[PDB]
Amino acid sequence: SMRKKIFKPEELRQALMPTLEALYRQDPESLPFRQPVDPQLLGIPDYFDIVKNPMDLSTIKRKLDTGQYQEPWQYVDDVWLMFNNAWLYNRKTSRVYKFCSKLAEVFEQEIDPVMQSLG
């Protein structure tokens, strides 16, 4: 333990992929988040005028799958970035905003004990 703590990609995937899978299993709530927002195809062309750092579940999954995170908190940051983009762009009356609120509740439930045990 008198060593710099390193999280190998496989350790991050084993600990963190279950928390991402818990989001994917929310149907329909994860549906708006499973792929990058395409503003033209979705009919929301000003999206990138508001959301400067887009994020979605498939991008997070690819980063875990390819070892692009060095520390667990970087994964957690990307999940919150995805949620905060949706709460910034969508109105409280919209289904996407309500779905985002549900996903964030699920994430908070799953992530806290996982981060505690990761150390």
Ligand SMILES: CCOc1ccc(C(C)=O)cc1Nc1cc(C(=O)OC)cc(C(=O)OC)c1
């Ligand atoms: C039409 C407005 O779409 C959006 C608006 C905003 C955002 C964000 C992340 O700020 C994302 C979407 N995209 C999206 C929405 C829904 C949906 O409302 O399902 C009930 C389903 C899918 C999908 O591919 O389901 C397979 C994709």
